[PDB]
Structure formats: C-alpha cells, structure tokens
Amino acid sequence: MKTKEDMQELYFPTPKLIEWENGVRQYSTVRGDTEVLMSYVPPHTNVEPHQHKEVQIGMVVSGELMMTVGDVTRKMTALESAYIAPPHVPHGARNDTDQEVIAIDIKRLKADETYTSPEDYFLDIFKTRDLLPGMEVTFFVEDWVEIMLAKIPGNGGEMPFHKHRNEQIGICIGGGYDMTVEGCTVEMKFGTAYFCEPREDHGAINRSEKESKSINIFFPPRYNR
Ligand SMILES: O=C(O)C(=O)Cc1ccccc1
Ligand SMILES: [Co+2]
Numbered sequence: 001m002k003t004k005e006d007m008q009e010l011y012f013p014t015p016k017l018i019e020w021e022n023g024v025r026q027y028s029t030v031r032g033d034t035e036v037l038m039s040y041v042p043p044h045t046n047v048e049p050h051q052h053k054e055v056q057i058g059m060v061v062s063g064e065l066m067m068t069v070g071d072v073t074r075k076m077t078a079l080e081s082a083y084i085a086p087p088h089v090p091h092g093a094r095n096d097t098d099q100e101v102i103a104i105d106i107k108r109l110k111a112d113e114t115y116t117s118p119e120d121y122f123l124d125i126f127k128t129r130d131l132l133p134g135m136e137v138t139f140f141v142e143d144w145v146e147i148m149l150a151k152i153p154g155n156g157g158e159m160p161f162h163k164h165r166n167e168q169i170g171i172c173i174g175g176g177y178d179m180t181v182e183g184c185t186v187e188m189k190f191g192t193a194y195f196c197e198p199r200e201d202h203g204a205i206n207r208s209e210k211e212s213k214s215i216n217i218f219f220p221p222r223y224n225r
C-alpha cells in the first residue's frame with residue numbers, strides 16, 4: 001500500500017538546499033545509500049580539497065571547471081568528461097572562470113560494491129549512439145557504473161515502461177518531460193532527480209515541443225557490460 005505522496009518521496013525525493021561560506025550552493029537529493037548533488041560554483045572560486053569514505057562521481061553540466069582528484073588536475077568541459085574519486089581519495093576544484101559552473105556529483109556507499117576508477121580518475125566519452133530511434137545517448141563506463149546522457153526528443157520521444165535489476169538514478173538537465181516510476185508520474189524540470197532501486201518499473205515520455213536532456217546512471221552497467 002503506497003500513497004501518491006508516499007511514492008513521490010521514494011522515487012523523486014524533495015531536495016534540500018545547502019549553502020557553503022565560500023558561496024557554493026548545492027541541491028541535495030537522497031535515497032538510501034546514494035546522494036545526488038547539483039552544485040552551483042561561483043566565478044573564480046576554490047572548493048577546498050577533501051575526502052570521505054563514500055565514492056563520488058562528478059560531471060560538469062554547464063561552464064568549465066578545473067578539477068583535482070589525487071594529484072591529477074584536469075579541465076572539465078560541459079558534459080564531455082566525468083571523474084571517479086574512489087573512497088578516501090582527496091579531491092577538490094576551482095572555478096577559474098568569469099562564469100558560474102553548474103555541476104553534478106553522485107556520492108555513494110553500498111554493500112558489495114568495489115569502487116574503481118581509471119588510473120588517472122577521469123572518464124572520456126566511450127561511445128555515442130541512438131539507444132532508440134531518434135534518441136541519442138552518450139556513455140561513460142566503469143566496471144561498476146555506467147553514465148548515460150540521454151536526449152529525448154519532444155513530440156512523443158519515449159522510453160517505454162520497463163524494469164531491470166540494475167539500480168538507475170538520474171537527473172534532468174534540460175527541457176522537461178514526464179517520468180514515471182512505478183505508480184508515480186512527475187513532470188521533470190532542470191535539476192529534478194530520480195532514484196530507481198532494482199526491479200522498480202520506470203519510463204519516460206516527452207510531450208513538449210522540444211528535446212529534453214537527462215543524465216542517467218546505472219549500477220552496475222547495463223549496456224556496456
Ligand atoms: O535505458 C534505460 O534503462 C532507461 O531507463 C532509459 C531512460 C532514459 C530517460 C528517462 C528514463 C529512462
Ligand atoms: Co566529495
């Protein structure tokens with residue numbers, strides 16, 4: 001027995017706003033062992049190095065960010081790179097530009113997961129292709145995680161309703177569309193996050209007049225095994 005509002009809090013949890021002294025603002029959404037943070041990093045601003053037991057996956061959605069993981073510093077272009085900072089590995093960043101950076105982090109710690117990364121921490125685009133006709137996706141791949149950018153066209157662009165054992169978590173980064181998880185449909189906006197546990201049915205349809213974009217993350221990988 002799950003109410004409408006009950007289900008909303010599970011699959012599309014209400015974010016909290018976090019503000020740091022340095023000026024960074026974060027929108028934080030949580031379900032169980034996984035946290036999604038959308039960060040707004042102001043111009044010419046440092047994010048002090050730190051480290052934690054949780055693994056963290058990061059990506060720039062807008063702007064350009066100087067990112068440090070371990071002793072590897074790398075310029076991050078919007079949506080063209082991701083990094084993984086394994087547990088306890090120190091990491092921080094600087095917005096070294098005149099413009100605000102919008103970024104996304106996933107912080108996670110779940111049993112029976114080994115958190116590896118490329119030797120230099122950063123992932124480049126593995127492959128871009130249509131997942132479904134007209135639906136362009138872009139993959140970033142590790143053993144235990146698969147990042148999939150998706151463009152869902154307007155005018156009926158749709159991911160049919162389905163499920164899989166893979167956990168799938170994500171966040172809308174453009175336009176709008178309807179997403180349903182089990183018995184719950186939400187109109188996604190920029191920043192709306194969703195969390196699907198194993199075997200929870202879900203789908204999406206974009207009945208707007210323009211394409212929408214999303215970031216979707218599989219644990220473990222679903223397409224590039
Ligand atoms: O490929 C899947 O398993 C998906 O769930 C794809 C997807 C894309 C956009 C919104 C929801 C699901
Ligand atoms: Co961190």
Ligand SMILES: [Co+2]
Binds near residue numbers: 202
């Ligand atoms: Co899915």
Ligand SMILES: [Fe+3]
Binds near residue numbers: 155207208209
């Ligand atoms: Fe239309």
